[PDB]
């Protein structure tokens, strides 16, 4: 799938 | 009188034709019932007709017709019509995109081994945002990096640009106002308890959506935080701000409409059976696109769903709305054009030369749809017929990791953010130039 910020 | 002038100074031969013998005004009145493609042919019959078909006010009208609002200027003899050169220039530009030889683009290497998470294009300035913690300001004319905006500690994921003001959002839960000219952070905006994911900049105010389920309205000038919108369960994915209402889309399947001044939630739009990821708003209609493969069109004044548009088969990632025409890009490899008034799906952009993976981005205008994709291509489409025109970009690495993240288009250039999760494609921007010499 696509890009998204890394989960914190 | 530009035509009277012409007649006596060129003194054309005697003619035996209806329009040469008609009073000059009634001739123009007859010439006006023609389409520009005809006027252009008529101008090549004889010198008298060429002079008549350069009546400025006949072309000021053909431009107003085609949404050309400014005359073009340059630096025996001829008195050229600026409206006419303005009109031709545009038809040439259009032809250039459509079938013009693709001049090799300016390669803007930067953000090595990272993603370009957000892209802006204003006049001659490009701004790339990245998970490398930095943003970069470039010239579309030279291809040179002019400023590298260093200051963020977490990665940049959102962006906004007006004129020499840049806003940025990051995993460091801060926003940042910048001087695009001097690459100087002027304000660091604190208040978000999670990643700053989306933002929308209306005039002197930006609204930010965050992974903390809140939005914050900020003053670009002062740096204050005018309001905080609280009511969202899940993270806030997309935001729109027209200056009068804030519309937000959250992973909690909900679209929320706010009056910011009162910090009040005016409407919670219910329907999406999965995370809403994309949003458009025109002061009248909210359009939301979900990981539930539907797109919903709501009345902002009543909260009433007006249409639920179906047919996409996966996540509607990016959407663009413009005079009640909507274009949606999706992971199903398909792009759709819709009439948000009637609900009809005008066109589905697929076919033998369709995208092979998900659509990552799109732009459109009254003639064209520009689409980008993980298949490493950027395609040009006939908006009116839905037909494929041509591939403007074809990464050699498209099938093995090359990807086009994002595109911005102007009337004369296309800017592409390109890269790869695996080293097949050095990350970079491509700048294509469709201007015509005149």
């Amino acid at each position: 799938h696509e890009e998204t910020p890394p989960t914190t | 009188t530009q035509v009277k002038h012409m007649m006596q100074v060129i003194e054309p031969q005697f003619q035996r034709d209806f329009i040469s013998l008609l009073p000059k005004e009634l001739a123009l009145y007859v010439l006006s019932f023609l389409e520009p493609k005809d006027l252009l042919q008529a101008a090549q019959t004889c010198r008298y007709w060429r002079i008549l078909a350069e009546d400025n006010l006949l072309w000021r009208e053909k431009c107003k017709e085609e949404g050309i609002d400014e005359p073009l200027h340059i630096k025996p003899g001829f008195i050229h019509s600026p409206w006419k050169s303005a009109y031709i220039r545009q038809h040439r530009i259009d032809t250039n995109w459509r079938r013009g030889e693709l001049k090799s683009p300016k390669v803007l290497k930067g953000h090595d081994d990272h993603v370009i998470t957000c892209l802006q294009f204003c006049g001659n300035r490009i701004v790339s945002g990245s998970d490398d913690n930095t943003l970069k300001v470039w010239s579309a004319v030279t291809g040179k990096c002019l400023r590298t905006l260093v200051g963020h500690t977490g990665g940049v994921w959102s962006s906004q640009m007006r004129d020499n003001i840049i806003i940025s959002g990051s995993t460091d839960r801060t926003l940042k106002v910048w001087n695009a000219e001097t690459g100087e952070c002027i304000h660091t905006l604190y208040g978000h308890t999670s990643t700053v994911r989306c933002m929308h900049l209306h005039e002197k105010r930006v609204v930010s959506g965050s992974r903390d389920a809140t939005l914050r309205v900020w003053d670009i000038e002062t740096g204050q935080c005018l309001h905080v919108l609280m009511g969202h369960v899940a993270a806030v994915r997309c935001v729109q701000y027209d200056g009068r209402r804030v519309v937000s889309g959250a992973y909690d399947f909900m679209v929320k409409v706010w009056d910011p001044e009162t910090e009040t939630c005016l409407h919670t739009l219910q329907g999406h059976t999965n995370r809403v990821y994309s949003l458009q708003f025109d002061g009248i209609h909210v359009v939301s696109g979900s990981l539930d493969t539907s797109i919903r069109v709501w009345d902002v004044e009543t909260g009433n769903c007006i249409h639920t548009l179906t047919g996409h088969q996966s996540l509607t990632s990016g959407m663009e709305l413009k005079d009640n025409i909507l274009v949606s890009g999706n992971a199903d490899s398909t792009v759709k054009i819709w009439d948000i008034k009637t609900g009809q799906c005008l066109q589905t952009l697929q076919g033998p030369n369709k995208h092979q993976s998900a659509v990552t981005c799109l732009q459109f205008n009254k003639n064209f749809v520009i689409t980008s994709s993980d298949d490493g291509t950027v395609k040009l489409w006939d908006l009116k017929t839905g037909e494929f025109i041509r591939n403007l970009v074809t990464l050699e690495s498209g099938g093995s990791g090359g990807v086009v993240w994002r595109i911005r288009a102007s009337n004369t250039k296309l800017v592409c953010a390109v890269g790869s999760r695996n080293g097949t494609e050095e990350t970079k921007l491509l700048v294509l130039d469709f201007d015509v010499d005149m």
């Binding site: - | 209806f18 009073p23 009145y29 042919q41 019959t45």
Partner: protein, 133 residues
């Protein structure tokens, strides 16, 4: 109710006040000036045709048969419509002429209008370079 107008030819026509006021010229002469309508720029032949159109009143079928005539009659109908101020006739007639140019090849329009290509060798090239499609 019926009024009298006299062509440049000298022939006076009987026309109903209402069919004649479709021309602003005749209307201004009748009401504001009070005349037996002298029309010095229209002959009886063209006046008869303009009244035929007016009595019958984007290109209507009747108008396309009425204007199916020689180029000379069309030229005089455009001038009489301008002189009489009949926006209807003027448009229908001017549109009928533009339509003879729509299918357009510079040479094909020349052949249809009896035009002579007065452009020099170089001039013609620059003109096509300029109106390039």
């Amino acid at each position: 109710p019926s009024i009298k107008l006299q062509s440049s030819d000298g022939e006076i026509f009987e026309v109903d006040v209402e069919i004649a006021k479709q021309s602003v010229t005749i209307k201004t002469m009748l009401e504001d000036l009070g005349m037996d309508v002298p029309l010095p720029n229209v002959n009886a032949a063209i006046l008869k045709k303009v009244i035929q159109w007016c009595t019958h009143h984007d290109i209507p079928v009747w108008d396309q048969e009425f204007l199916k005539v020689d180029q000379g009659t069309l030229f005089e109908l455009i001038l009489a419509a301008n002189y009489l101020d009949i926006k209807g006739l003027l448009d229908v007639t001017c549109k009928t002429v533009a339509n003879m140019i729509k299918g357009k090849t510079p040479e094909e329009i020349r052949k249809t209008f009896n035009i002579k290509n007065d452009f020099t060798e170089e001039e013609e090239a620059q003109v096509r370079k300029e109106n390039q499609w």
